[PDB]
Ligand SMILES: OC[C@H]1O[C@H](O[C@H]2[C@H](O)[C@@H](O)[C@@H](O[C@H]3[C@H](O)[C@@H](O)[C@@H](O)O[C@@H]3CO)O[C@@H]2CO)[C@H](O)[C@@H](O)[C@@H]1O
Ligand SMILES: [Cl-]
């Protein structure tokens with residue numbers, strides 16, 4: 001039997017359907033008292049919401065895979081048991097297991113495959129228009145945010161650089177302090193004068209008002225964008241961009257969304273938390289998340305269900321996940337520093353605060369900063 005009390009943290013608009021998932025959980029485990037709330041600052045900030053006070057945080061919490069190495073090294077999350085590991089590995093696609101594995105051990109329960117795509121109004125742009133960045137932006141406005149390094153760091157990967165080495169595990173393996181890195185910096189700078197590129201902190205609102213024809217966004221907004229655009233909804237994988245005069249695919253990050261178990265829980269409550277984490281990331285639960293938000297399951301069987309297989313967003317995400325189209329977010333303990341330093345590097349190139357004469361120096365300093 002499983003008993004205990006657990007607090008579950010999810011993102012704000014997910015609460016209603018996680019209550020449904022928890023109702024399903026309680027059909028099987030009637031003696032576990034679950035309290036579902038939003039987290040203080042979201043899954044993108046689990047690192048710091050938990051780290052502020054691990055013992056006060058939720059017992060099960062949503063967290064993106066890049067945060068896992070830091071949290072594992074800090075002792076905030078424990079390795080999954082052999083049986084829990086086997087279930088994750090057998091039930092989900094390979095990249096989901098890679099996403100949660102740190103130094104050979106799994107530290108979270110994966111449930112969604114995240115890659116950004118182009119979402120666009122098909123009354124304003126065609127499927128062919130969205131194939132290239134310059135062609136798209138010559139025909140309509142793309143609204144985006146150069147202060148968000150998750151949007152634009154992957155241009156460095158398109159340029160041929162590595163982030164923490166071949167598989168994201170090498171402390172000194174970021175080699176963006178190179179001519180290839182400078183090509184990406186130059187691309188950011190070029191976008192400031194591209195009249196088809198609108199800087200905004202709320203790209204979704206610009207799409208909704210009609211001031212943008214396209215945005216880059218991820219599947220956490222799939223159902224939201226389908227509702228906004230209605231019959232004008234369309235989606236595509238990322239386009240090509242020109243780097244050093246060559247057309248190359250513009251990458252996104254590939255992220256794996258997970259739930260992790262807070263290592264503070266003990267006794268019954270710990271067993272209840274692990275049971276909940278497993279359940280809310282199971283196939284049925286992944287499909288409920290899909291039904292409500294449009295996020296893409298990592299479960300092998302769910303990905304091949306007729307409804308997922310026929311969803312154009314799922315198809316675009318599957319394309320994005322292929323080699324060359326995205327890179328799995330690394331999970332090095334340094335990642336919080338990486339993100340903090342990457343955003344002003346990129347935005348400085350975009351705004352001109354970093355001029356071309358300083359690209360090499362700034363990239364050298366960046367690599368030193370993130371490689372400790
Ligand atoms: O920008 C730095 C930031 O990048 C990464 O965060 C991204 C998440 O991985 C990704 O899931 C997405 O987050 C959204 C949630 O999924 C959604 O439920 C809701 O909370 O909105 C979030 C977006 O605001 O996008 C973010 C990037 O914006 C990385 O995981 C972070 O650790 C890193 O700090
Ligand atoms: Cl381009």
Ligand SMILES: [Cl-]
Nearest residue numbers: 264265266269
């Ligand atoms: Cl406890």
